[PDB]
Amino acid sequence: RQYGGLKDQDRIFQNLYDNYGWDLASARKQGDWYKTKELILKGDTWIIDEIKKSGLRGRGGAGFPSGLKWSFMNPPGWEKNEGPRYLVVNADEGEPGTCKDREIMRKDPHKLVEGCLLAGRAMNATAAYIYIRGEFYNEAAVLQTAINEAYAAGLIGKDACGSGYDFDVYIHRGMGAYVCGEETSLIESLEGKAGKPRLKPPFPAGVGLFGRPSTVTNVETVAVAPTILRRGGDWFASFGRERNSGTKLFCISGNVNEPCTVEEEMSIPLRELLEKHCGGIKGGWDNLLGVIPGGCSVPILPKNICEDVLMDFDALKDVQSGLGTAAVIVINKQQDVIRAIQRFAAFYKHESCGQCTPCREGTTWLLKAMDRFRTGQAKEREIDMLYELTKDIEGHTICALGDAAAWPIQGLIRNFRPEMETRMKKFHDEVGAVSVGGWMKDARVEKGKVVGAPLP
Amino acid sequence: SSYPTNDIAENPYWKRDHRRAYPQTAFFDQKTVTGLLELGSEATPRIADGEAGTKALANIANGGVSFTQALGKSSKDVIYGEVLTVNGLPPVAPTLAPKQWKIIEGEAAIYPKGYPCRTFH
Amino acid sequence: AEIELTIDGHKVSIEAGSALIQACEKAGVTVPRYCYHDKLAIAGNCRMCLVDVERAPKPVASCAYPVAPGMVVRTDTERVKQARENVMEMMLQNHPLDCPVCDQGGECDLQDQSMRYGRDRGRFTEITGKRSTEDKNIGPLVKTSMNRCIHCTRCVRFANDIAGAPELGSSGRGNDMQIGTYLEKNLNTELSGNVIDLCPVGALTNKPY
Amino acid sequence: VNPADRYLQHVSDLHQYAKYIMAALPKYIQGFSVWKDELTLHVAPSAVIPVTTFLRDNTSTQYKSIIDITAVDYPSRENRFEVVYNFLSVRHNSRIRLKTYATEVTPVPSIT
Amino acid sequence: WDIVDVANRWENDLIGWQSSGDYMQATQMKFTSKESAIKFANKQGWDFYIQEPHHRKFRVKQYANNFVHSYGKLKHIRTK
Amino acid sequence: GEHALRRYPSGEERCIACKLCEAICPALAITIDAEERIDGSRRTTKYDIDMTKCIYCGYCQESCPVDAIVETPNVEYATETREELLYNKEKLLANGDKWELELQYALDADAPYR
Amino acid sequence: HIVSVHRNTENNNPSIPFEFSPENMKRAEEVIAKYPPQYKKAAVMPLLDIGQRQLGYTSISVMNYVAKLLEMPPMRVYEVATFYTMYNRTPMGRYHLQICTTTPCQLCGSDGIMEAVQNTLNIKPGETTKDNLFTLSEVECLGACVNAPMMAINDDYYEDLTPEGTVKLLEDCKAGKMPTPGPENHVRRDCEPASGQKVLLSKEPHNVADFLQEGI
Amino acid sequence: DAYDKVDFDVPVGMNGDCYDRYLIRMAEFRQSLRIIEQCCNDMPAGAVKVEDFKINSPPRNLMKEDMEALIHHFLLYT
Ligand SMILES: Cc1cc2nc3c(=O)[nH]c(=O)nc-3n(C[C@H](O)[C@H](O)[C@H](O)COP(=O)(O)O)c2cc1C
Ligand code: SF4
Ligand code: SF4
Ligand code: SF4
Ligand code: SF4
Ligand code: SF4
Ligand code: FES
Ligand code: FES
């Protein structure tokens, strides 16, 4: 039951390094659109009940099961709606660490289009919008060429695959905002407004995009959908543990010897993940200061914990952390953690949409405190303070960006308190002592700006 | 300032406000004392069959029994336990902190003997 | 046609599908808020009306959480009092020290709810300090001093919906969001002196008075 | 610490004392209220003189000294004024209040 | 009390003080109920006018009202 | 003692018409009218104290956030008419002019304790 | 940072005119047809981009004209293109340096890349060059985190960088000749490990057609 | 008001005259001077007003820096 190192026959994607070309005939040789006509002719209930048997959790970072997510979409009187239902593919990633979905779309744009049709058939969707990042220009160009190849083959369009089912994939490109990664902010950005998230109890499966029902799925969990309908749920359910099933693309980045992107099993050890497929760590296992599984929005695992931890949802929720997008950002021992998490807090200050008051007023305060703690201009208590001002943002916001901006600060305070105390004692004996807020006894407000203090 | 109040991060104010934690006037009618004599108390409830106990409460709440009838129906143990003291004596008018006096007589007094003023401590 | 639930032990019946803050207003329960108004659309911006709801993991916004049957609502939870102190402290750390010069002295919604629900002291004491927002000349009838804005969208929601003047809006992200015309365009409508009773802080105020 | 916490045992003793006082004169005591070591007996105006004598004469009470007596108007009530009496037993070191009512023209009898 | 035409207020020659001849202008009472106020006012022998209060009409609000599907002309752009 | 409206360094009137001295005064001695002046700055048009109904509680000095009105320790200003004992804005600006060297000495020793 | 409030001095006016090129107009009518005929306004995001391809930047003439085109008030265009980072409303040069500085670039030396750029030029990360050729812009995560230090020039990303190769990249762009279309100085393909290929070492793919469910 | 912590005695006359009302005044001077000495010796440090700024005002150092305390200062006086 040694989890990890699956065979080459057991990988879902085969283009992940570009040995085989992204061509449509190359996708036929890969095995795409081989039985889609028969799959569309199958009922939606069979597709939903097959994806419930797989244990397909959500690959966007939330983790929510995709069979249950796709089944909430049909209450038994959906036919009385008598209109268009839309599917939305979240191909926007900007999560620091991950490259996996750019690797979906550049390498294999065709299993995306296939999974769009299959997941639209599962929920009786009339059309589908793929939301590409506006930075990703060449990715959007390659996807548009591949969707045009799918129109020319007749596998998509007014009569998809000779089955009497209409389906249109359009492309929307989002000009550089990361809060539009959230599903409801994504819906509003497709609606043509500014991309702000909305509140929860109008659920989007009930009433969503254009005032019509719509769900928002990650581009990877849609690109996995045709092969998992072909290979079966019993084959996918064998990998991983009992609730965390299957495989996942891992983007291993940061300061490893060889940064890479693999696709390997869930519930695998982190040491066998970093050692066997990415060179090692630059300096060995002695040279591990910390690791961030997932994107920016995950607390750090310290050195003694990350030896025997598995890469599923359970073994990271048990260590009060998240799997997220399974980006693995390791942090070098010769690098500083405080500079890193200062940069994470500056990221969340730049990327917040600014609608609700605790998130918007909070990440500016988190940046003003982390610059000060990186310089060292504080008292020993103000990091217990910073813990409390993490806790007050953490759960009072519209979307989970306030929840996301809380967590790395909390992981820093839980795992690297003496690393902060050392910098603060360093500032206390290089120059004079400091009051609350960074004020020194020489510091006075002259005309215009403040002098006497070095202004972090 | 003192330490658990000037503290920058551990207290919230709602734990340490006491203006908003003021207690209320315990206003007691004559009929709620009949309730306390016949239903009982929360320390010693003399009520069984709670679904019928609400109906047993309700006629007193509407004015079924009277207060003199409540005193007459009440047992001698109830009268000597909760109305009177346990020995059967009336309760003394209560004081918060009792003061026991001690007259200072000798050379530690403020006036010596022969002056009509005494020190009482 | 109606739904019966429980707030603060009080049992209340209200028409179906209403907001939870209308159930709290019907039962007499006082819930503080900054971006809710009877004649305006619902927004969940200000995060002030959080409330303890059984069968909910987080405190939900009482202005946009719809009424369901069998509902048990508590407003005096220690978690709700902590939530109101938190959100109130968050509102006050970029709001400038203008109370002797503000026009809403005894009238400020932010100010009377900061005694009743907010924190005693303030921990905002950075050297870098508060942000500063450029003043925005709108028109001759409305004096506009936007340092003391809390971004409640209430003026924008109103001039969109009822006045029919779509010139107001919100342009930016983060702290660099502003509430004004983007071009420095003058605002007309036939009732433009009604946005200055509507703003809960004194950012939009009366010019001859 | 809550300064109301130091009262609580004496406030319970004051409750038991007042329940006895109501059980002793049921004809004349309409209610009582205990705030925080402050006892108030709630009595009709034709019942002023029989209660006060009791507060003077019973050995358990002995409220000898009159302290201050006054009125408060609530114009929303039909009987506009309420008349409060404060007593102090210097034996038992205890205070007590006695509240009655009176309209603008109808009297309350004097304890002089 | 309703004001007197001549007796309310007038500017002082000296400084600009608001001087009054009406003496009930500052008095104002609070009552619990409407009936108690009427009973007291005709008990003291006064001529009163009574003004009925005005509450707001209950209208059901949904947040999901904000984005319902428009089959014809949109005739509005929400912004939030 | 008597009252004084101070001025900033480089001469500006300090009274931003916040009406806090009027709202707290237990004997209603303060009367103020305030108008926005030509600069757009908030200043008092009329400031006034009746010294015949002032009671010298010092709440007007405790209340001002700018610290615009103070109490000078002068008690030697007894007059012969009432009209002279009514102090407008001009008499109090001339006092806060005259006593400013002294009010420096007072608020150098008081201002930590305030 | 985001700065919103618009100055009305010169070259940004409601008075200065703007129209689509006819190829841009045909593309505009093609893009509006992707959305339902009610909700025309949902095409506000690409069409401004279309205008951003024609002019150097997004002026107020393009935002006013797209508002006139779409049956919208112009404030609804001002909100949408102020909320987005990518609608650059100031004029820039030709090349727009987007150096990523988020932690996975910071841990592998994006400090050295940004220093090696702004030593070669003399400009700040918001400043443009007086030749109107280059414009620095420090930017957050550009999606290539595995290619660990990187940047973006116009739509092409340049990755796996060294501070010695970055100045040669800049000297290539200072001469007009484009450096490479490729993502690096030819050290890998896209995301394969720099030593070589650990997995997918085959010449033809395994077909999915032999491993089927039998459920059809 | 911390008279329990401070030790003193009380003079109480015996005849109800004006002379024993005189002699007990003359000794409450003595007992008051005893209070003053025992409170000069045992004076502690700490805050002199109550802890919170919802019933009395913040210091002028704090209310010119603190937004919360400026709100409380401006409300406790209007
Ligand atoms: C601020 C924020 C940013 C997000 N960014 C992404 C993203 O870039 N890619 C993604 O797949 N999910 C992202 N999510 C999660 C989305 O909500 C996700 O589409 C949904 O929750 C789950 O989709 P799934 O069922 O495919 O996992 C983000 C969520 C938040 C709150
Ligand atoms: S959490 Fe922040 S970025 Fe997200 S909706 Fe709320 S205010 Fe906007
Ligand atoms: S609106 Fe704000 S600045 Fe003005 S008085 Fe109220 S709290 Fe003070
Ligand atoms: S301008 Fe006023 S009403 Fe509008 S959001 Fe700002 S503070 Fe609120
Ligand atoms: S003197 Fe002070 S309190 Fe009086 S109006 Fe001027 S600033 Fe306000
Ligand atoms: S000293 Fe007192 S009475 Fe006199 S003006 Fe000041 S607050 Fe008023
Ligand atoms: S009023 Fe409900 S959150 Fe703003
Ligand atoms: S982290 Fe720098 S590009 Fe993704």
PDB file of N, CA and C in Angstrom, chain A residues 118-157:
ATOM      1  N   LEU A 118     -18.925  16.806 -21.938  1.00  0.00           N
ATOM      2  CA  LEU A 118     -19.396  15.729 -21.070  1.00  0.00           C
ATOM      3  C   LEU A 118     -20.018  16.267 -19.782  1.00  0.00           C
ATOM      4  N   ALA A 119     -19.414  17.293 -19.175  1.00  0.00           N
ATOM      5  CA  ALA A 119     -19.988  17.870 -17.965  1.00  0.00           C
ATOM      6  C   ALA A 119     -21.199  18.741 -18.268  1.00  0.00           C
ATOM      7  N   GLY A 120     -21.302  19.286 -19.482  1.00  0.00           N
ATOM      8  CA  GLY A 120     -22.536  19.938 -19.875  1.00  0.00           C
ATOM      9  C   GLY A 120     -23.657  18.953 -20.123  1.00  0.00           C
ATOM     10  N   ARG A 121     -23.323  17.751 -20.587  1.00  0.00           N
ATOM     11  CA  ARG A 121     -24.339  16.721 -20.737  1.00  0.00           C
ATOM     12  C   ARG A 121     -24.768  16.175 -19.386  1.00  0.00           C
ATOM     13  N   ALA A 122     -23.851  16.148 -18.415  1.00  0.00           N
ATOM     14  CA  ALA A 122     -24.184  15.641 -17.087  1.00  0.00           C
ATOM     15  C   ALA A 122     -25.192  16.525 -16.363  1.00  0.00           C
ATOM     16  N   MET A 123     -25.238  17.815 -16.684  1.00  0.00           N
ATOM     17  CA  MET A 123     -26.071  18.773 -15.968  1.00  0.00           C
ATOM     18  C   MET A 123     -27.040  19.464 -16.911  1.00  0.00           C
ATOM     19  N   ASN A 124     -27.134  18.985 -18.163  1.00  0.00           N
ATOM     20  CA  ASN A 124     -28.056  19.482 -19.193  1.00  0.00           C
ATOM     21  C   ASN A 124     -27.829  20.965 -19.475  1.00  0.00           C
ATOM     22  N   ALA A 125     -26.561  21.338 -19.596  1.00  0.00           N
ATOM     23  CA  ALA A 125     -26.195  22.716 -19.873  1.00  0.00           C
ATOM     24  C   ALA A 125     -26.311  22.999 -21.362  1.00  0.00           C
ATOM     25  N   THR A 126     -26.746  24.213 -21.693  1.00  0.00           N
ATOM     26  CA  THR A 126     -26.936  24.580 -23.090  1.00  0.00           C
ATOM     27  C   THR A 126     -25.676  25.165 -23.708  1.00  0.00           C
ATOM     28  N   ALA A 127     -24.831  25.812 -22.914  1.00  0.00           N
ATOM     29  CA  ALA A 127     -23.602  26.397 -23.422  1.00  0.00           C
ATOM     30  C   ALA A 127     -22.551  26.333 -22.327  1.00  0.00           C
ATOM     31  N   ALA A 128     -21.346  26.789 -22.651  1.00  0.00           N
ATOM     32  CA  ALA A 128     -20.254  26.753 -21.693  1.00  0.00           C
ATOM     33  C   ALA A 128     -19.286  27.880 -21.999  1.00  0.00           C
ATOM     34  N   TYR A 129     -18.854  28.571 -20.953  1.00  0.00           N
ATOM     35  CA  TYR A 129     -17.871  29.635 -21.065  1.00  0.00           C
ATOM     36  C   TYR A 129     -16.615  29.219 -20.326  1.00  0.00           C
ATOM     37  N   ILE A 130     -15.481  29.264 -21.011  1.00  0.00           N
ATOM     38  CA  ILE A 130     -14.185  29.021 -20.394  1.00  0.00           C
ATOM     39  C   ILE A 130     -13.534  30.363 -20.118  1.00  0.00           C
ATOM     40  N   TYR A 131     -13.167  30.595 -18.869  1.00  0.00           N
ATOM     41  CA  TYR A 131     -12.613  31.872 -18.446  1.00  0.00           C
ATOM     42  C   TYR A 131     -11.096  31.740 -18.390  1.00  0.00           C
ATOM     43  N   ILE A 132     -10.427  32.260 -19.391  1.00  0.00           N
ATOM     44  CA  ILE A 132      -8.972  32.230 -19.441  1.00  0.00           C
ATOM     45  C   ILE A 132      -8.449  33.505 -18.802  1.00  0.00           C
ATOM     46  N   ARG A 133      -7.302  33.388 -18.146  1.00  0.00           N
ATOM     47  CA  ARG A 133      -6.570  34.540 -17.658  1.00  0.00           C
ATOM     48  C   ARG A 133      -6.160  35.451 -18.811  1.00  0.00           C
ATOM     49  N   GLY A 134      -6.347  36.760 -18.628  1.00  0.00           N
ATOM     50  CA  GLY A 134      -6.007  37.718 -19.670  1.00  0.00           C
ATOM     51  C   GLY A 134      -4.525  37.868 -19.902  1.00  0.00           C
ATOM     52  N   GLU A 135      -3.715  37.513 -18.908  1.00  0.00           N
ATOM     53  CA  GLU A 135      -2.279  37.384 -19.109  1.00  0.00           C
ATOM     54  C   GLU A 135      -1.956  36.266 -20.096  1.00  0.00           C
ATOM     55  N   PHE A 136      -2.720  35.174 -20.049  1.00  0.00           N
ATOM     56  CA  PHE A 136      -2.429  33.970 -20.826  1.00  0.00           C
ATOM     57  C   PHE A 136      -2.911  34.193 -22.253  1.00  0.00           C
ATOM     58  N   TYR A 137      -2.087  34.889 -23.037  1.00  0.00           N
ATOM     59  CA  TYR A 137      -2.481  35.224 -24.401  1.00  0.00           C
ATOM     60  C   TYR A 137      -2.294  34.044 -25.344  1.00  0.00           C
ATOM     61  N   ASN A 138      -1.099  33.448 -25.341  1.00  0.00           N
ATOM     62  CA  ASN A 138      -0.820  32.327 -26.232  1.00  0.00           C
ATOM     63  C   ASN A 138      -1.616  31.090 -25.848  1.00  0.00           C
ATOM     64  N   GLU A 139      -1.886  30.917 -24.554  1.00  0.00           N
ATOM     65  CA  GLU A 139      -2.752  29.838 -24.086  1.00  0.00           C
ATOM     66  C   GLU A 139      -4.165  29.998 -24.630  1.00  0.00           C
ATOM     67  N   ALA A 140      -4.680  31.230 -24.630  1.00  0.00           N
ATOM     68  CA  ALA A 140      -6.007  31.493 -25.176  1.00  0.00           C
ATOM     69  C   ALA A 140      -6.034  31.305 -26.687  1.00  0.00           C
ATOM     70  N   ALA A 141      -4.932  31.637 -27.368  1.00  0.00           N
ATOM     71  CA  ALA A 141      -4.857  31.423 -28.812  1.00  0.00           C
ATOM     72  C   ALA A 141      -4.864  29.938 -29.163  1.00  0.00           C
ATOM     73  N   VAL A 142      -4.086  29.136 -28.431  1.00  0.00           N
ATOM     74  CA  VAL A 142      -4.036  27.700 -28.691  1.00  0.00           C
ATOM     75  C   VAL A 142      -5.371  27.044 -28.358  1.00  0.00           C
ATOM     76  N   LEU A 143      -6.029  27.494 -27.280  1.00  0.00           N
ATOM     77  CA  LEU A 143      -7.346  26.950 -26.963  1.00  0.00           C
ATOM     78  C   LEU A 143      -8.375  27.332 -28.022  1.00  0.00           C
ATOM     79  N   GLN A 144      -8.302  28.551 -28.568  1.00  0.00           N
ATOM     80  CA  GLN A 144      -9.260  28.933 -29.603  1.00  0.00           C
ATOM     81  C   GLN A 144      -9.052  28.132 -30.884  1.00  0.00           C
ATOM     82  N   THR A 145      -7.791  27.859 -31.249  1.00  0.00           N
ATOM     83  CA  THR A 145      -7.536  26.991 -32.401  1.00  0.00           C
ATOM     84  C   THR A 145      -8.057  25.577 -32.168  1.00  0.00           C
ATOM     85  N   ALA A 146      -7.916  25.062 -30.947  1.00  0.00           N
ATOM     86  CA  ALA A 146      -8.397  23.712 -30.671  1.00  0.00           C
ATOM     87  C   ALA A 146      -9.919  23.635 -30.645  1.00  0.00           C
ATOM     88  N   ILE A 147     -10.584  24.671 -30.126  1.00  0.00           N
ATOM     89  CA  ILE A 147     -12.046  24.678 -30.149  1.00  0.00           C
ATOM     90  C   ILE A 147     -12.541  24.819 -31.582  1.00  0.00           C
ATOM     91  N   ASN A 148     -11.807  25.554 -32.425  1.00  0.00           N
ATOM     92  CA  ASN A 148     -12.175  25.642 -33.837  1.00  0.00           C
ATOM     93  C   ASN A 148     -11.993  24.306 -34.555  1.00  0.00           C
ATOM     94  N   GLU A 149     -10.955  23.546 -34.188  1.00  0.00           N
ATOM     95  CA  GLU A 149     -10.806  22.188 -34.710  1.00  0.00           C
ATOM     96  C   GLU A 149     -11.965  21.302 -34.277  1.00  0.00           C
ATOM     97  N   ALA A 150     -12.450  21.504 -33.051  1.00  0.00           N
ATOM     98  CA  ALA A 150     -13.599  20.742 -32.578  1.00  0.00           C
ATOM     99  C   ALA A 150     -14.894  21.151 -33.275  1.00  0.00           C
ATOM    100  N   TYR A 151     -15.031  22.421 -33.665  1.00  0.00           N
ATOM    101  CA  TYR A 151     -16.177  22.798 -34.494  1.00  0.00           C
ATOM    102  C   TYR A 151     -16.092  22.154 -35.871  1.00  0.00           C
ATOM    103  N   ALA A 152     -14.896  22.160 -36.469  1.00  0.00           N
ATOM    104  CA  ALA A 152     -14.726  21.610 -37.811  1.00  0.00           C
ATOM    105  C   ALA A 152     -14.924  20.102 -37.840  1.00  0.00           C
ATOM    106  N   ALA A 153     -14.588  19.404 -36.757  1.00  0.00           N
ATOM    107  CA  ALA A 153     -14.867  17.975 -36.697  1.00  0.00           C
ATOM    108  C   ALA A 153     -16.335  17.666 -36.442  1.00  0.00           C
ATOM    109  N   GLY A 154     -17.139  18.662 -36.077  1.00  0.00           N
ATOM    110  CA  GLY A 154     -18.523  18.431 -35.723  1.00  0.00           C
ATOM    111  C   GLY A 154     -18.736  17.869 -34.340  1.00  0.00           C
ATOM    112  N   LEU A 155     -17.679  17.742 -33.542  1.00  0.00           N
ATOM    113  CA  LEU A 155     -17.795  17.159 -32.215  1.00  0.00           C
ATOM    114  C   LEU A 155     -18.399  18.135 -31.217  1.00  0.00           C
ATOM    115  N   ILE A 156     -18.565  19.391 -31.618  1.00  0.00           N
ATOM    116  CA  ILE A 156     -19.157  20.428 -30.790  1.00  0.00           C
ATOM    117  C   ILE A 156     -19.977  21.314 -31.720  1.00  0.00           C
ATOM    118  N   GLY A 157     -21.022  21.918 -31.177  1.00  0.00           N
ATOM    119  CA  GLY A 157     -21.809  22.827 -31.979  1.00  0.00           C
ATOM    120  C   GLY A 157     -23.301  22.656 -31.817  1.00  0.00           C
TER     121      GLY A 157
END
